[PDB]
């Protein structure tokens, strides 16, 4: 392997954390 | 010596989104309290 190939699914789950934070953002409280 | 793939677009993508994560968690933290 190249030692980097999870950076695809890493970006996936980071995007998903971002989505959860969006979910924390429709009300901000 | 043939090596083609659509990886290069993930470098800027993953890091841009990991900046947006911190941007958003700061916006969350401050406005809340």
């Amino acid at each position: 392997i190249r030692g980097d190939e999870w950076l695809a699914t890493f970006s996936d789950t980071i995007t998903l954390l971002l989505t959860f934070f969006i979910l924390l953002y429709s009300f901000s409280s | 010596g043939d090596e083609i793939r659509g990886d290069e677009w993930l470098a800027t993508f993953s890091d841009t989104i990991t900046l947006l994560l911190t941007f958003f968690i700061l916006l969350y933290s401050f406005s809340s309290v």
Partner: protein, 252 residues
């Protein structure tokens, strides 16, 4: 073969439309053009005209021009061997025609001529190698465009994010702006892995299949050049077929 293209978009479009919201938000004429025009432009930077214009005239060969091989090369070789050996001579031109499809005659017109097994082998191997190279070139041109599509989708995403930030009122525009921004990278990623990379790997797989077919031809063209027992030749010829086909041909 084109039946898969409508499915690869209809399945995801149904998934996009699982009773959640109108797909009007999933479509923005600006972002479509950013992504596709940018990938096309970077393709023009990469390949010039008369060499990027040669793309479609090779990719269209993947949608048509099917091969009869893997069950019929064996038959059309064993009957030719039985007709040349034991009957007349190998120069029987009467029956060497009527099946001039693409490549078998490329060497069969030569074995009836005065050559040596090495020069015919070298012409045939050169043809196979250059076919693989042309398909590799097309597949490279397709994977490279599949790479430029999401790169420019992310470029457009960054453009949208820049002109969204420091341009908004910081109340509720943050979300919708992000949506209409990431529309661009959605289009790029979708087009890439739904159209191009599958088509590039399709070119590569078709090159593999036609390469096995041309090797199967050449091994047997050389046999007709030598006039060998059709049994041995039927055996070396059939030693190219999937186990289902090694039997499916057996009862024929």
């Amino acid at each position: 073969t084109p039946i898969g293209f409508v499915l690869c978009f209809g399945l995801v479009l149904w998934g996009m439309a699982s009773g959640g919201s109108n797909l009007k938000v999933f479509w923005d004429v600006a972002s479509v053009f950013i992504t596709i025009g940018g990938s096309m432009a970077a393709m023009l930077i990469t390949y010039p005209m008369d060499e990027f214009k040669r793309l479609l005239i090779v990719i269209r060969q993947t949608f048509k021009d099917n091969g009869m091989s893997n069950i019929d090369v064996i038959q059309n070789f064993v009957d030719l061997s039985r007709k040349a050996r034991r009957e007349g001579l190998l120069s029987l031109e009467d029956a060497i025609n009527n099946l001039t499809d693409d490549y078998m005659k490329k060497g069969l017109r030569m074995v009836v001529d005065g050559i040596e097994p090495e020069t015919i082998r070298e012409i045939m191997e050169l043809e196979i190698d250059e076919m693989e190279k042309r398909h590799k070139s097309g597949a490279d041109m397709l994977k490279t465009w599949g790479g430029y599509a999401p790169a420019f989708g992310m470029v457009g995403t960054l453009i949208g994010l820049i002109q969204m930030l420091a341009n908004l009122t910081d109340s509720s525009t943050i979300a919708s702006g992000m949506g209409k921004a990431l529309i661009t990278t959605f289009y790029g990623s979708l087009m890439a892995n739904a159209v191009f990379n599958p088509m590039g790997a399709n070119l590569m797989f078709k090159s593999g299949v036609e390469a096995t077919t041309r090797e199967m031809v050449l091994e047997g063209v050389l046999a007709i050049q030598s006039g060998v027992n059709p049994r041995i030749m039927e055996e070396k010829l059939v030693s190219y077929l999937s186990p289902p086909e090694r039997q499916a041909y057996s009862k024929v």
